[PDB]
Amino acid sequence: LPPAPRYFQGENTAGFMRPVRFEGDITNLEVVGEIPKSIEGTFYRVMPEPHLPSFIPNDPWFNGDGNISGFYFKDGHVDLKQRYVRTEKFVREAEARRSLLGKYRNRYTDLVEFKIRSTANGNIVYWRGQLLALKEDSPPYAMDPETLETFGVYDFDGQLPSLTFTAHPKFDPVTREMVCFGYEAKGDGTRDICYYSFGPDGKIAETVWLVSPVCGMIHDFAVTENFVIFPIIPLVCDVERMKQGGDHWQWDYSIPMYIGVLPRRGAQGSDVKWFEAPHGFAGHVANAFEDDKGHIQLQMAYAKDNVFFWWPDANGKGPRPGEVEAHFANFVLDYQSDKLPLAEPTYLVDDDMEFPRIDDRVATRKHKHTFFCIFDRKPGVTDFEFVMPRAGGGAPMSNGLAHLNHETGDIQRYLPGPRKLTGECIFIPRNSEAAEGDGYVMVLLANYEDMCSELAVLDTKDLTNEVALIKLPVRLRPGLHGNWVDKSDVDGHPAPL
Amino acid sequence: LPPAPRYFQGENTAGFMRPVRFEGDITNLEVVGEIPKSIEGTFYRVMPEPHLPSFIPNDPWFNGDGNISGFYFKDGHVDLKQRYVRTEKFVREAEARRSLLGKYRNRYTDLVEFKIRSTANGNIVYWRGQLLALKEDSPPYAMDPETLETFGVYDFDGQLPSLTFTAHPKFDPVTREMVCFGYEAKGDGTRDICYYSFGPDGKIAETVWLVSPVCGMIHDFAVTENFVIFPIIPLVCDVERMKQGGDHWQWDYSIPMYIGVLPRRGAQGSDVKWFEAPHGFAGHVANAFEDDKGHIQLQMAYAKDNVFFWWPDANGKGPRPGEVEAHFANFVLDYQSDKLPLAEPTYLVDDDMEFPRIDDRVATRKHKHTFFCIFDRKPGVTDFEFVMPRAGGGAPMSNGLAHLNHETGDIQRYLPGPRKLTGECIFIPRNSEAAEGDGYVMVLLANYEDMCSELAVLDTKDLTNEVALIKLPVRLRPGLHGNWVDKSDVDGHPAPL
Ligand SMILES: Oc1cc(O)cc(/C=C/c2ccc(O)c(O)c2)c1
Ligand SMILES: Oc1cc(O)cc(/C=C/c2ccc(O)c(O)c2)c1
Ligand SMILES: Oc1cc(O)cc(/C=C/c2ccc(O)c(O)c2)c1
Ligand SMILES: Oc1cc(O)cc(/C=C/c2ccc(O)c(O)c2)c1
Ligand SMILES: Oc1cc(O)cc(/C=C/c2ccc(O)c(O)c2)c1
Ligand SMILES: [Fe+2]
Ligand SMILES: [Fe+2]
């Protein structure tokens, strides 16, 4: 076998990116300021965190074993519980005490044959009394919300029709449906997309098989009252390249950014329309909704080049680190239109941004508040001379949050400080009567001065001010998505506005 | 109640002394170099680590909740398990989410009435299939060696005759007895010492009640073939002072360092002889043995002033931090002598030292190897300008280990580096046939550059060289005692030479 390294090496595991790999508990976290006593619930987040050194050099951040953090809040006190998802990969590698899974989404490089290759490191959502740890090449892994025990691969009582389940299902706050899809839904290199949904009772509702024009990456999607929308990143998969040891994904500069639109209920596969947006990178969706005219307003991060620059085109053409900005775009789509090309989007703000969140009580409907990460290159905002030697590589950087009020156009910006960076935020309604976007924002900070993590609590009345700063004595490696599960919500999801 | 702080403040919890308070697992620790594959067993150590901020300002290091680390070795791989002892204090404070126990060994300052005030933070030893977490004001807490679960207060099947059990029992390698005592054995301020022992079958053997000349601190003791030996630190307890909120301990410059000698088997309390060594501080015992003449050679750390300077005399007189050195002393005692005053000891080395270990296969018998912590003020050995601002306070500092060969007088010194300090080492026999003092030494390092801990593995053939350096991504706060439990030893203790 290729030798197994016994310590981590390379920039992707240096500095603040160095794996800690702890599982367990830290109760009664230290708090500067005061956590509002009325906050009750749990912030779950997932980070990629390799449990064992990879035999693949410069293994991407996206390929690390998913480790779940839960921050449990009650009466102004907070406890941390942390545990790895017991994926097939995690368990077999733990047994062997060495890495066995190879390159990202390339089974031809694995040292053993895996049935499930999930690292379960994309998202951690709540559904019908379980956590689901998501990874878009795999079914979910189900976990216990209280103990973070892994139950195992979850197939929705034998109903799951797809080999793959998106990291970005949407929760309809009115119907209480979980709306889902998977791409490469019949395995490596397949252009099959399976669109499917589950009612609040756990029974499958929709199942529609459609066909993508290319085998392209569909990381996120959007859901409106009457439509589902599939933006395709121009990363394309060729299995013959993979069999020779090559990358799953390769940029294609010659294609549009396809945006498929399908009727949400009762459709056939042939009902999809593949609109063609200008070439670019489909980032995370804030939210989509139908306006008065029945037109889809799709609000999402959008870049004009390959954000995932480590997967360039066939000739190695692509951007350098830190070069590509994504902007908060609005696309207008009309399902009734026969014109496939779409105009350039309008932009809601100037900021280099990503990881947009809304008040999910209006998900799939018109929203007027968005919270998002920003990266401001303006001199002084980040002390790069101090931070970059301590940062490692392989993960995106955010040096603030912004709150856009879409009606007034007012923006507030939270800057944690020149030697701190942020992850994706969560929004918490102040209470069950709170107006849209009124409540608390929490975000995990990397503090490069202390080389510790912190959890900031902000009030939406003034996003510039920390109400509380929870001071962890360990590092939580930069992670991906996370979710709030409020104690007042019996099914784990907030009530509609 | 006095207010409960919600974050740690003061020098005793600053820098590397800041509590982490993690419990759980980190498997497959990163390793630089190579752990000898034949090493099989577990290194257990205990640190004081306050679970909650104290309502007592500048609470001493000795008053922190005991947290147990286990480093489990097999086939050159190592896993960490970490868990707090579930003392009465730990559990009640966890339930309340605030500190309730008050000043060190002063129940009159507690916010609730405790039955057992143990922090179980002094030592962690193996006995008849359990760990015993020791604290000299209390009985032991029994724990599971594999899971570190706490079973509860341990009273040896109802046989424990004393309220108190020393942090420093001795294991006789020939008889397989655990030889024990407790001072203040009938409660606060009592001069009762209870000497007791347990045979390898768990049955109590000796129980002898004796009377100390003063109510002084007897932190450690020594055992030979035919005698047990009780050195008294001139810290003295007055319960009336304690009832007014004063300190348990107060130095007395007017008394000798008493050294009691009692026949090991069949004695009455009146058989003790209280020899009178020159005034000074009784540090940790390396080992004691009887020579050819039947005279006791007692080898221990010994200082000429109050090492515990935060407990000065009645008029507040005593040394400053970093002023008092302890030296490796040899005292000669003759039980048959009627002369009580003892000569000044001879000194085996000149180093400022503490935390001596021997090859416990010759415990209670003549030894010719000692391993110990040293603090060398020689320019450059420690980079104080870098270290001291990051160090915090309240704990002793060691910047190397030394190995003394008592026959040849040769000393080897291990220096981890200018920005690292050490804890107490353990010795591991190379194998069951190894000569005395031949095998491995392990020691936990504080790395102030990384603000991480590391576990160094040394071969006694050359103590200056690390064969392996195990790199923890967290800090383990400076701790006290620890022990090796070898897999090849059925009763957890090594076979006699
Ligand atoms: O030694 C082996 C051989 C093998 O062929 C499979 C396994 C483990 C399978 C597994 C363990 C945990 C999971 O969560 C999961 O999806 C799969 C272990
Ligand atoms: O900074 C960004 C921006 C973005 O729009 C998407 C991502 C992550 C996508 C992803 C893609 C494949 C994976 O396997 C995975 O875990 C995550 C990260
Ligand atoms: O009056 C009370 C009230 C209470 O809420 C708890 C206790 C004691 C609990 C305890 C828990 C664990 C231990 O190991 C132990 O010795 C004691 C006593
Ligand atoms: O650096 C030193 C030198 C020494 O000779 C003894 C000690 C520790 C003694 C101790 C005394 C009382 C306690 O309650 C406790 O946990 C520990 C520490
Ligand atoms: O006359 C003295 C007395 C003393 O106590 C220390 C020094 C110098 C210390 C030193 C010099 C160089 C270093 O790199 C370093 O860590 C420490 C000089
Ligand atoms: Fe995502
Ligand atoms: Fe001790």
GROMACS .gro file of C-alpha atoms in nm, chain A residues 43-45 123-125 168-169 171 284-287 328 353-360 367-373 401-404 406 423-428 436-437 441-442 480-484:
model
   49
   43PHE     CA    1  -2.643   2.536   1.701
   44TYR     CA    2  -2.516   2.237   1.502
   45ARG     CA    3  -2.226   2.279   1.259
  123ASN     CA    4  -2.432   2.003   0.615
  124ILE     CA    5  -2.604   1.896   0.936
  125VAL     CA    6  -2.982   1.945   0.933
  168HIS     CA    7  -2.889   2.182   0.061
  169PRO     CA    8  -3.249   2.052   0.106
  171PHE     CA    9  -3.767   2.329   0.441
  284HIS     CA   10  -2.492   2.928  -0.251
  285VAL     CA   11  -2.858   3.021  -0.286
  286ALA     CA   12  -2.994   3.279  -0.041
  287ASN     CA   13  -3.356   3.210  -0.137
  328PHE     CA   14  -2.493   3.868  -0.451
  353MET     CA   15  -1.967   3.756  -0.032
  354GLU     CA   16  -2.093   3.400   0.023
  355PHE     CA   17  -2.280   3.175   0.271
  356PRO     CA   18  -2.611   3.372   0.261
  357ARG     CA   19  -2.881   3.301   0.519
  358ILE     CA   20  -3.238   3.427   0.538
  359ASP     CA   21  -3.511   3.405   0.799
  360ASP     CA   22  -3.619   3.053   0.706
  367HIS     CA   23  -3.775   3.750   0.180
  368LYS     CA   24  -3.646   4.098   0.265
  369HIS     CA   25  -3.350   4.015   0.492
  370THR     CA   26  -3.024   3.838   0.407
  371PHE     CA   27  -2.723   3.774   0.632
  372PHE     CA   28  -2.398   3.674   0.461
  373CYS     CA   29  -2.022   3.640   0.492
  401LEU     CA   30  -2.089   3.944   0.824
  402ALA     CA   31  -2.337   4.177   0.653
  403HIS     CA   32  -2.712   4.220   0.701
  404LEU     CA   33  -2.900   4.357   0.397
  406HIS     CA   34  -3.389   4.451   0.090
  423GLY     CA   35  -1.769   3.099   0.938
  424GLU     CA   36  -2.130   3.083   0.813
  425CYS     CA   37  -2.379   3.253   1.047
  426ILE     CA   38  -2.715   3.132   1.177
  427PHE     CA   39  -3.024   3.343   1.239
  428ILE     CA   40  -3.245   3.289   1.546
  436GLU     CA   41  -3.884   3.876   0.981
  437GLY     CA   42  -3.510   3.903   1.046
  441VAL     CA   43  -2.712   3.601   1.481
  442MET     CA   44  -2.443   3.357   1.590
  480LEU     CA   45  -1.908   2.445   0.623
  481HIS     CA   46  -2.278   2.466   0.701
  482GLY     CA   47  -2.471   2.476   1.027
  483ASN     CA   48  -2.825   2.513   1.156
  484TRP     CA   49  -3.022   2.635   1.456
   0.00000   0.00000   0.00000
